Amino acid sequence: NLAPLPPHVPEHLVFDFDMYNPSNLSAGVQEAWAVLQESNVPDLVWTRCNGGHWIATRGQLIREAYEDYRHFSSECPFIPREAGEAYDFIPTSMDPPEQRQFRALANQVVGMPVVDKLENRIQELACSLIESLRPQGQCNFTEDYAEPFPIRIFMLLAGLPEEDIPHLKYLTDQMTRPDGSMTFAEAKEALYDYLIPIIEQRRQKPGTDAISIVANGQVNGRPITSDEAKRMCGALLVGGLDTVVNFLSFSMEFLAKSPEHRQELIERPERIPAACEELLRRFSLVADGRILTSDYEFHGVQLKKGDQILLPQMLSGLDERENAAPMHVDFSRQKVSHTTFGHGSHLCLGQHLARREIIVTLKEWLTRIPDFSIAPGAQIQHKSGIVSGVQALPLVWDPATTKAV
Ligand code: HEM
């Protein structure tokens, strides 16, 4: 379904890209989004899909817009407009300077310091999880590791019982890839209902878990309110439940289809870190945007106040103008340029946790299960949305080849 073209949007700039259901989705989700960068597509286009909105197709514009919060506000970061308007997570929907305070408190619960004191657990969990699968000679990756691994760590992080994983997970998925059952608002409201009671209890006594830290936090002056606490916790759900999870499946799907790259890491461990960044560029997966604060001519195009513009974080690193032969995975890429963890004042606060989980996965997995491949005769399917992901990943291997360390 297409929205009628607003009077102010050029005739020649219309490219009906459906961010939640791209035409070339069959060739991989990153490949589907890459069409927006073909020789005949303007740097900045307008799509009549999902309420109609702009779409910067080049990392140059993307990076640029993400730096100018004065014009491109995070107030309404999601598409459709109903989703963005409803989006009120702190600080992801705030613009500087208001953001500073909250982002600083949020940084306390997932930043590097937290990731370092968690390294051992993260590592132990990966091993424990993999050692379990190893003798099976097969697995449904997305659900057997890609999900349990990041989520349990996040739940331990937040101090939330693991029983709530399916619940919190489903709702979170509705904010990134709506199955259609519920709107963004409803999903958000549902998550808030889960958090609020928890915040109330934790607000009392201190606490090492994320929710406590936030609930007992102090932003610009007075103590943090429950609503603020709520909005802050929310901003952590997508990352702790839906981003890493999907990223691992993309990266692992690739590794299963490319023995070469696997062998390379297996016999050249030291390259795992660099390999992680390249996979982060290649299989980048987030794409949100901003809303115009006023009428503004941006690169020849006249944007009106209230317009929404999609700045796919996943496109920068695929832009041939920033990375030669972008669709090729080269662990030895001299300059791995990308905006996978975003760009600007909203740079991902969990990228450290992300990278560690990715590095621990590649390390522990390849060591114990170096030789594996996609189950015989199976097609891997992707899904596109605020956060694209992999539907399922059937992997198989011979147990005799596995190892225990
Ligand atoms: C590999 C996985 C991940 C990717 C690709 C990713 C990507 C991003 C991107 C592109 C943004 C910018 C959003 C915007 O500007 O509107 C962002 C923000 C954010 N991410 Fe992540 N992220 C990942 C994992 C995580 C994890 C595991 C967490 C922690 C639970 C997390 C927490 C956050 C937070 C709190 C923000 C908001 C920062 C702010 O508004 O100041 N992310 N992420």
In order of their start, the domains of the chain are 1-405 (1.10.630.10)
Query: Where do the DSSP E strands lie in 5-133?
Result: 44-47, 53-56, 72-73
On whether the CB atoms of residues 315 and 17 are closer than 8 A, the answer is no
Amino acid at 299: H
- 10 Å Cβ neighbour count for 75? 16
Name the phi and psi angles at 257, rounded to 5: -95, -5
Sign for the CA dihedral angle at 305, 307, 313, 318 comes to: negative
Contacts of 26 (CB under 8 A, 6+ apart): 32
> Which residues on neighbouring strands pair with residue 382, listed in sequence order?
390
Three-state DSSP state, 53: strand
Distance 136 CA to ligand 1 centre (A): 34
Report d(CA 199, CA 191) in Å as an integer.
Answer: 12
CA of 376 to the centre of ligand 1 (A): 35
Instruction: Output b/e per residue, 282-299; b: 16+ Cβ within 10 A.
Output: bbbbbbbbbbbbeebebe
Beta bridge partners of 290: 309
Query: Directed axis angle between helix 226-241 and helix 165-176, to 10°?
Result: 90
Instruction: Strands of 57-137 (E only): list them.
Output: 72-73
**Which residue ranges make up the annotated binding site for heme?**
348
Ligand 1 pocket, residues with Cβ under 6 angstroms: 74, 77, 91-92, 103, 106, 110, 154, 235-236, 239-240, 243-244, 247, 285-286, 288, 313, 340-342, 346, 348-350, 353-354
Residue nearest to atom 25 of ligand 1 (CA): 239
Resolution of this structure in Å: 2.1
**48's tokens:** 């009549």
* Cα–Cα distances in angstroms (integers) from residue 223 to residues 57, 102, 197, 220, in the given order: 42, 12, 18, 8
CB 368 within 8 A of CB 134: yes
Residue 241's contacts (CB-CB under 8 Å, 6 or more residues apart) are 150, 151, 154, 168, 169, 172, 173
> After what residue numbers is the chain broken, C–N > 2.5 angstroms?
none
* 65 touches 56 (CB < 8 A): yes
What 3-state DSSP class applies to 57?
A: coil
Nearby residues of 180 by Cβ (< 8 Å), 6 or more positions away: none
- In degrees rounded to 5, what are phi and psi of residue 49? -85, 150
Contact 375, 395 (CB under 8 A): yes
φ/ψ of 388, rounded to 5, equals -80, 155
Of 239, 248, 242, give the one whose Cα is nearest residue 280: 248
What does the alpha-carbon distance between residue 66 and residue 87 come to, in Å, rounded to a whole number? 18
Contacts of 234 (CB under 8 A, 6+ apart): 88, 89, 90, 188, 191, 192, 195
Distance 22 CA to ligand 1 centre (A): 23
Query: Which of 359, 366, 372 shows the shortest CA–CA distance to 149?
Result: 359
215 within 8 A of 227, measured Cβ to Cβ:
no
Q: Which structure tokens are listed for 353? A: 């946790």
Q: Which residues contact 215 (CB under 8 A, 6 or more apart)?
A: 199, 202, 203, 207, 224, 226, 229
Indicate which technique resolved this structure: X-ray
Q: Is 132 left (phi over 0), alpha (psi -120 to 50) or beta?
A: alpha
Task: Give the gyration radius of the chain's Cα atoms.
Answer: 21
The answer to whether the Cα torsion of 153, 157, 162, 166 is positive or negative is: negative
State the greatest distance between any 2 C-alpha atoms of the chain, in Å, as a whole number: 66
H or E segment at 389?
strand 389-390
For atom 4 of ligand 1, the residue with the nearest CA is 341
Percent helix, strand and coil across the chain, each to the nearest 5: 50, 10, 40
Q: What is the residue type of 208?
A: T
Which runs of E-coded beta strand occur in 240-388?
288-292, 296-298, 301-303, 308-311, 373-374, 382-383
